[PDB]
Amino acid sequence: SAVQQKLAALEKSSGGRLGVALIDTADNTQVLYRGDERFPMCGTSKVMAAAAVLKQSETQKQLLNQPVEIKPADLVNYSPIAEKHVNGTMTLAELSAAALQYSDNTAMNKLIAQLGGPGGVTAFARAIGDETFRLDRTEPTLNTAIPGDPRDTTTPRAMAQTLRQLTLGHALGETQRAQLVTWLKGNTTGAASIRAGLPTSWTVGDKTGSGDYGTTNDIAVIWPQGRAPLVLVTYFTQPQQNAESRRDVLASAARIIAEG
Ligand SMILES: C=C1CS[C@H]([C@H](NC(=O)/C(=N/OC)c2csc(N)n2)C(=O)O)N=C1C(=O)O
Known part of the structure; x- marks a missing residue:
């Protein structure tokens, strides 16, 4: 498709490796670019951890109010x-x-500990039907983003499907889903990533990630006015361990998606 050709051209211009997954919930149409390749999630994995704690709170009604020491x-x-x-x-x-x-x-790391370790976050992913997500390490080493390393990775296709189930679907209870949506809409780190490529009248909730190898990530749920919401994952990683972050690539990928 022509959106795929533009995403491929963006990727060629960037010198790195771009992964995109779009779900248009109006008709369940998808746009995938390297949609089945694994990418280091970095901080985009924090959505799965927060969601797994919200799931626990469906039975542990006051769990969210439990104090945790910061030593x-x-x-x-x-x-x-x-x-x-x-x-x-x-x-x-x-x-x-x-x-x-x-x-x-x-x-x-406190969310991971509440879940019993990284295996507890992966367990929640499997419980909601995500067979691809894997969390293997704690912070900060889960962001090493080593080329080819399967640890702490997922695919754009899988993460878009999961983000849809968590925010627009019913993987979580109604109040837990609303709380996750509120948290994502209030993100402070995303202004230069997906948000920067979208019409400013669209409501966005997102979670970024960044790591070594210039890894620059964003996953977002998008509410345009007058049409059904979208889910967009944009993952980017580079050949050099000390590469600069490239949030502009994520903004440009979002701009291309919104044009198509
Ligand atoms: C605002 C930040 C940076 S701190 C956080 C975290 N990233 C790292 O700690 C990290 N950043 O390297 C650039 C790292 C750890 S070890 C290594 N080699 N690199 C994450 O992705 O969760 N996330 C974001 C974000 O973009 O949301």
Whole structure:
């Protein structure tokens, strides 16, 4: 298709490897580019962790209000919210919002621990029908994004399907889904990624990720006014371990999708 030709040209211009999956919920049509290749998820994996804790809260009614200690030894790099509460506590709701809206890495580690380890996050993915997602490590090493490494990867096709089930479908209870949607719409890290390529009248909830090899990721649910919502995954990674981030590639992929 012509959208695929434009995505391939964007990828050729970028020097890296681009993965795109679009679901148009109006007719369940999809656009895939490298849609079955694995990509390092980096922080886009935090959506699965927050969702798995929300699922637990369907039976543990007050789980989101449970305090969790933030100790000095817990603090890993890029933890701007948790660092403010060292030697104090944050609730699981606050940790979920921090992991999702600021990509706080310590917050993610608290979600992983609540689930019993990385295997607990993968377990939730399998429980909702995602056979592809795998979380293998904690923060910060899950972002090493080593070429070919299957650890901490998924495919664009699988992550788009999962993000649809979590936000627009019924993988979660009604109030849990609404809470996840609120958190994603309130993300603070996404202005230069998918959001930057879309008409500004469209409502967007998204979660970014970044890692070594210039890995630059974003997954989004998109509400245009007057049409059914879309789900868009944009994954990007590069050959050089010290490559710069390329959020412009993600914005440009979104702009191409919105044109088609
Ligand atoms: C705003 C950030 C950066 S901190 C967070 C996290 N990424 C890393 O900690 C990371 N970034 O490297 C550029 C890393 C860890 S180890 C390694 N080699 N690299 C993540 O992706 O969850 N996410 C976002 C985001 O884009 O949302």
